[PDB]
Design a protein around this ligand. Structure first.
Ligand SMILES: Nc1ncnc2c1ncn2[C@@H]1O[C@@H]2CO[P@](=O)(S)O[C@@H]3[C@H](O)[C@@H](CO[P@](=O)(S)O[C@H]2[C@H]1O)O[C@H]3n1cnc2c(N)ncnc21
Length: 1338
């Protein structure tokens, strides 16, 4: 059969009769025969119960019975009587049909709602039947034909039935995951998530809307299998973790291999069909059927490749997710089991980090593993195809691609070093900014704001130098990326043309190799990432192996007996296998309900005893028989971040009477009162911090509530005061407390409660010297006596304006020029490939190469240009935005700083500014590039085929809807996952810190179950994110495949009016457009969530600012305060009025103080002098000039203040005294000498340039106060204000020494100093209670 006359070269293409009856029937039957055996593996290993008896299942089974009969009815007619094929073809078909009906039967038995096999098999059978059908209907325009019609109709109905999903098996999961219930088609197309996609677009997702996890992804089903496998390997054996990993999750992972192979083959199938189409358009006088025949082949191959690839994505990521979950669980269990000796050597941060990155590396590696063979083979295969196409010249074409792999790497590593440089400078600035943010009070008072702004600008210049260098380096980074396509094309084509003149450049020889270069880009660029990830995963394997192999505790140490209470005979314990025994000879019997105080010389082994009783020490010998539950009060109190109530409860049923008897018996009532929410307050490191004594009380309260029979109290009363300790012992530990019948064993170094103890076990270097009772031990006069004797589109326009209109417009124009250069390069290639051959060589071949080179060189330069433009633009915008934000912040009044959430300014200056200067330019570059790559593909499709504008509207609508839904619903899922990630590591830190208490109470099961919930919660948000990426993927590749199909169809329909090169270029760009579309959506999502930073940086633009610092119309004279005559004329300060009815007059050079209680307007009065808060009603005038009219800086410079706590800023002492450096060195020296500081200031090796740290931590409080006094003295102003809280004698004498000439206001909380100052003003509630000298006061 297979004669090309009727199958290939004919107007009516009909498969031959033999071919119809043999191969078209062997294909489907054969598919089920090879899959059937393999399918039992899945059907057996994976079970979900059995589906009930439904009409659908039966309908399918009955049609399977009838179909088999019909096919065997053919054998009956063939038997009735010639051709051998008229017997076997139907018989085999009947047998495979009997396998099909048996398969739906067993699939019902094994719980299968929809079958992919029973769907692909029917699809293949349908296509084969369709081919025979068309042939049989063309043969007759009766005997065995009618049997085939019946067969085809039954097969079609069977295929339609196989699409519907059956009922769920009878054998809660509120809001579950539709993955386990969706039909084969929905799983293939990932439609089941579109629900959340639409819902997320309308109702912003929360933690409870997220679907539950399928049973296999729950940590409760993936940790026990890994634990069992690791136990089996450990018991069998240097145990290897990799063998465990690929034995536990490898079988599910191996299905990725098939998908990867099919995807590679289907990816390569594209260029071959492209070559066939280019041949077809060049081959005139050829049937249209061959051209349309292929346009279908391209479409089907592209769609199938898209579907298979994402299954692989899903499969790998599922395996990686499972890997992460199982590693997390095993690490948690190991950490709860391992020995203290093996645990101390490894750092706590080492272990939390082992779960923070090492565990996740493997989860990520899942997407860089298969490439280990996909990337080489692809490349190799591609190279071979390229070698088949052009020749050895293509080696030169790729010689530059392999040259870009190291170069690009060298680029990234360098900018990493700049990343290190920039970051460093940024740290310094934020540090400086932090000092301004917490010290804005002092700056405004001295008007030193501009001086600090200058230092901020200097640090910013330092940061922008590195930013400029990184900017220039980035420009070549994009240049090479965009130039690569042209570079490889020009290099290979110029070499091909120049090497030999007989080499003809045809459309197939130029565009097929051009597309092969595109499918070579990826496998050649991911290899370094794959290798780096594999090496990091290998070091993670080593780290996890050495951790999971750690030594462990053995329950044999203590023989706990369910409730002579504590029994130890000849027991020696160690803290390590090789270290000497901490306790050599331990032998004691503690009876039930007895109080035993282990007492001894610090460094004896008291805490070791309790640790041993808890099986924390390593028992080298002996016998310990602790009887009943043990409640441990550790020396170092472990506090859970949960509320104080749940700290005391410790996962136990709340009993109001017992809880309320425990809380005050520990004297926790005052602590409950001071704490904000009472016992519901969030204690711990993260929440409210607690004093050591409060932590010990909480630990003791938790132990007392747990109601154990044996208590091990390792110094519970170390941090509680003597009265609190005695009260606690009276109501808790004493014989008349809460634990009267409980076997208490306490470690103490305090004698006060010793006589009340039943037995006192004194030790010595880990050896009991005497074991008796207080009175008996005292009578014996031995070791115990010795012890006792011991003692929004507008934000984009705002960002463009920040860059500047000129730079943005120039960048857009140059980037359009790049676009046109690339397009005309492609058009020139198309025109070049169409030249005829005369005398065995192209008519023109040198001028075409020259124009190609010129076009490409123009492309490269403008790419390097516009990239540099946005780099300069980005840096310009960063400078302008920082300057504007700094001006707005510093110009704002204090009320803004007080009222704003203190902390949202810091991340604005650090995180959002970092977002602006670095991420925004890169994102705008790549988004703009992707957008115009898509537009170029569209225009080169529409230009080459004018009548293709009917497909743009629907596909654009599909793209717009998909992009809208994805961006909206994915930037929220990412936030949910990010939020959910942290609690796992926080809980691990808590467990690591409290493991001894966790094991002592034997509540490790509860905390194991808790770590289940948090990891499951994180997975519940991570899984929808990857499925969201898959949903994007399938929708966008469907759009791209439709583009390819329509481009090829509209090129084939107009073969006469088109040339080979034009069709080739159209198809190559249409093939490329899918990746550009995907990255365009991904980049648009990146830009939407990135540009908002500018919006939050444009804040405080209109925020009410202070009065102008310099008016310059009503500026005062140089000697503004000639005498300093202050007059508060009906002053009222809004804050309802803290200051009210203030009519006072302080004469020039008259000492005046302000006295008043808390809540008066004493301090607010100073804020009136410096205009910190605008006067609600008042006319303060100094001498003959109003303050409100004067600019702020002027008055703030002519009046000085010595505040409550002097703020010393980082830098030299001279910059502290004179930030402007306006005063000469002699003045600074004189002021420092007059401030009783000459002796100290001369002592520093740096002279005046002593580098004081943040807040002057190196300097003492007295020194900082004297430095502030030195600042005030150096100012030399007639009006000075003092704010009083050892060195008081010195500062008081100094303010009384030379400032007698100047007018001094004084607000002191101490009456002793104010008595010296005449004219005291007393403020009761803002009113002037008394106005006169202290002599008139008394
Ligand atoms: N199935 C597949 N087959 C072939 N290649 C595939 C592929 N899937 C993915 N890609 C990749 O998609 C990108 C296609 O490029 P674009 O679509 S033209 O744009 C990129 C992209 O937007 C993003 C990163 O994309 P990226 O992952 S780095 O890698 C390439 C390409 O390798 O940033 C842009 N971009 C990349 N490099 C630069 C640069 N130096 N300067 C500015 N913008 C850059």
């Amino acid at each position: 059969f297979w004669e090309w006359n009727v199958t290939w070269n004919t107007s009516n293409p009909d498969f031959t009769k033999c071919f119809q009856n043999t191969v078209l029937v062997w294909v489907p039957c054969s598919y089920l025969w090879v899959c059937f055996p393999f399918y039992f593996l899945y059907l057996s290993h994976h079970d979900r119960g059995y589906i009930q008896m439904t009409h659908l299942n039966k309908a399918k089974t009955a049609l399977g019975f009838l179909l088999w009969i019909v096919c065997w009815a053919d054998l009956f007619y063939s038997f009735w009587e010639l051709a051998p094929v008229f017997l076997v073809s139907p018989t085999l078909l009947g047998i495979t049909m009997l396998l099909a009906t048996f398969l739906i039967q067993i699939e019902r038995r094994r719980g299968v709602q929809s079958s992919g096999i029973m769907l692909t098999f029917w699809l293949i059978a349908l296509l084969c039947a369709l081919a025979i059908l068309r042939s049989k209907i063309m043969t007759a325009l009766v005997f065995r034909d009618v049997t085939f019609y019946i067969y085809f109709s039954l097969v079609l109905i069977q295929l339609v039935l196989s699409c519907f999903s059956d009922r769920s098996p009878l054998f809660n999961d509120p809001n579950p995951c539709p993955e386990s219930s969706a039909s084969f088609l929905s799983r293939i197309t990932f439609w089941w998530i579109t629900g959340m996609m639409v819902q997320g677009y309308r109702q912003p997702l929360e933690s409870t809307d997220l679907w539950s996890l399928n049973k296999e992804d729950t940590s409760e089903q993936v940790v026990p299998v890994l634990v069992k496998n690791w136990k089996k390997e450990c018991a069998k054996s240097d145990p290897s973790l990799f063998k465990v990993l690929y034995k536990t999750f490898g079988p599910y992972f191996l299905m990725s291999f098939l998908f990867k192979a099919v995807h590679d083959l289907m990816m390569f199938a594209g260029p071959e069909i492209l070559k066939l189409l280019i041949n077809f358009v060049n081959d005139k006088k050829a049937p249209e059927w061959q051209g349309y025949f292929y346009t279908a082949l391209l479409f089907i191959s592209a769609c199938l490749q898209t579907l298979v690839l994402h299954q692989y994505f899903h499969i790998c990521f599922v395996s990686g997710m499972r890997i992460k979950t199982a590693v997390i669980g095993a690490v948690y269990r190991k950490a709860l089991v391992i020995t203290n000796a093996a645990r101390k050597s490894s750092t706590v941060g080492e272990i939390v980090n082992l779960m923070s990155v090492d565990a996740q590396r493997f989860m990520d590696l899942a997407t860089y593993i298969n490439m280990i063979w996909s990337a080489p083979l692809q490349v190799i295969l591609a190279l071979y195809l390229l070698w088949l196409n052009l020749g050895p010249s293509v080696l030169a074409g790729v010689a530059v691609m392999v040259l870009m792999v190291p170069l690009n790497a060298v680029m990234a590593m360098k900018t990493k070093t700049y990343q290190v440089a920039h970051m460093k400078s940024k740290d310094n600035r934020i540090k400086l900014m932090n000092e301004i943010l917490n010290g804005i009070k002092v700056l405004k008072l001295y008007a030193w704001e501009l001086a600090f702004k200058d230092k901020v600008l200097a640090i910013r210049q330092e940061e922008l130098k590195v930013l400029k260098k990184s900017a220039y380096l980035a420009a070549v980074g994009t240049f090479t990326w965009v130039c690569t396509p042209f570079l490889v094309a020009l290099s290979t084509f110029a070499v091909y043309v120049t090497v030999d003149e007989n080499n003809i450049l045809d459309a197939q020889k130029a565009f097929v190799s051009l597309a092969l270069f595109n499918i070579l880009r990826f496998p050649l660029n991911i290899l370094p990432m794959v290798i780096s990830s594999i090496v990091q995963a290998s070091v993670s394997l080593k780290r996890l192996r050495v951790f999971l192999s750690h030594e462990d505790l053995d329950p044999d140490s203590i023989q706990r007996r369910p409730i002579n209470s504590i029994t130890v005979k000849n027991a020696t314990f160690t803290w390590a296998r090789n270290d000497p025994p901490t306790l050599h000879g331990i032998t004691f019997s503690v009876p039930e309900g007895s109080l035993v105080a282990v007492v001894g010389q610090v460094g004896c082994g008291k805490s070791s005893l309790l640790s041993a009783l808890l099986a924390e020490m390593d028992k080298v010998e002996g016998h310990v028989t602790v009887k009943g539950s043990v409640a441990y009060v550790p020396q170092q109190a472990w506090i859970q971040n949960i509320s104080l109530r749940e700290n005391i409860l410790f996962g136990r049923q709340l009993q109001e009477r017992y809880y309320k008897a425990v809380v005050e018996a520990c004297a926790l009532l005052p602590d409950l009162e001071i704490l904000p929410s009472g016992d519901r307050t969030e204690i711990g490191e993260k929440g409210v911090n607690l004093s050591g004594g409060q932590k010990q009380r909480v630990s003791l309260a938790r132990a007392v509530y747990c109601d154990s029979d044996v208590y091990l109290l390792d110094d519970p009363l170390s941090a509680v005061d003597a009265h609190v300790g005695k009260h606690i012992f009276e109501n808790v530990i004493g014989p008349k407390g809460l634990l009267k019948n409980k076997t208490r064993l306490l470690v103490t170094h305090a004698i006060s409660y010793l006589p009340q103890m039943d037995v006192i076990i004194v030790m010595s270097g880990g050896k009991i010297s005497e074991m008796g009772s207080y009175q008996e031990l005292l009578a014996r006069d031995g070791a115990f006596a010795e012890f006792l004797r011991t003692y929004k589109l507008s934000v984009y326009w705002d960002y463009m304006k920040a860059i500047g209109l000129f730079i943005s417009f120039l960048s857009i124009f140059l980037f359009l020029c790049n676009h046109v250069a690339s397009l005309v390069s492609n058009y020139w290639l198309s025109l070049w490939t169409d030249d005829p051959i005369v005398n065995g060589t192209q008519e023109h071949t040198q001028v075409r190469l020259s124009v190609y080179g010129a076009l490409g060189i123009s492309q490269g330069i403008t790419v390097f240009g516009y990239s540099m433009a946005v780099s300069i633009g980005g840096i310009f915008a960063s400078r302008r935005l920082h300057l504007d934000l700094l001006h707005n912040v510093l110009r704002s009044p204090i009320s803004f700083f007080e009222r704003t959430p203190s902390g949202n300014l810091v991340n604005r200056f650090s995180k959002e500014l970092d977002t602006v200067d670095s991420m925004i330019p890169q994102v705008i570059k790549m988004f703009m590039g992707s957008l115009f790559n898509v537009i170029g593909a569209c225009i080169i499709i529409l230009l080459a085929t004018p009548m293709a504008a009917v497909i743009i509207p629907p596909l654009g609508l599909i793209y717009f809807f998909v992009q809208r839904f994805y961006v909206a619903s994915s930037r929220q899922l990412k936030r949910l996952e990010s939020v959910s990630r942290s609690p796992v590591y926080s809980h691990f830190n808590e467990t690591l810190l409290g493991v001894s208490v966790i094991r002592a109470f034997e509540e490790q099961e509860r905390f194991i179950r808790q770590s289940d919930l948090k990891v499951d919660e994180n997975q519940k948000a991570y899984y929808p994110s990857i499925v969201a990426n898959r949903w994007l993927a399938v929708r966008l590749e469907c759009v791209g495949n439709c583009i390819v199909l329509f481009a090829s169809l509209f090129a084939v329909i107009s073969r006469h009016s088109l040339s080979a090169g034009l069709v080739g270029l159209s198809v190559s760009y249409s093939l490329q457009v899918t990746t550009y579309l995907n990255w365009l959506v991904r980049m648009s999502s990146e830009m939407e969530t990135n540009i908002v930073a500018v919006e939050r940086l444009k804040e405080y633009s209109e925020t009410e600012k202070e009065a102008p610092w310099q008016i310059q119309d009503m500026a005062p004279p140089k000697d503004w305060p000639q005498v300093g005559r202050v007059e508060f004329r009906d002053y009222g300060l809004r804050y309802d009025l803290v200051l009210k009815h203030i009519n006072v007059t302080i004469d020039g050079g008259e000492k005046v103080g302000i006295v008043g209680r808390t809540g008066a307007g004493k301090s607010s009065l100073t804020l009136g002098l410096f205009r910190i808060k605008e006067s609600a009603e008042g006319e303060i005038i100094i001498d003959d000039i109003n303050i409100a009219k004067i600019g702020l800086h002027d008055l703030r410079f002519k009046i000085t203040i010595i505040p409550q706590d002097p703020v010393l800023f980082s830098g030299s002492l001279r910059m502290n005294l004179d930030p402007f450096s306006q005063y000469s060195d002699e003045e600074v020296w004189t002021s420092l000498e007059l401030a009783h500081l000459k002796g100290f200031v001369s002592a520093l090796p740096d002279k005046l340039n002593h580098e004081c740290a943040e807040g002057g931590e190196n300097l003492s409080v007295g020194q900082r106060q004297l430095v502030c006094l030195a600042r005030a003295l150096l100012r030399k102003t007639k009006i000075l204000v003092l704010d009083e809280a050892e060195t008081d004698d010195l500062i008081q004498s100094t303010i009384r020494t030379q400032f007698d000439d100047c007018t001094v206001l004084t607000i002191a909380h101490r009456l002793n100093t104010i008595m010296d100052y005449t004219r005291v003003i007393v403020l009761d509630k803002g009113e002037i209670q008394e106005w006169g000298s202290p002599s008139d006061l008394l």
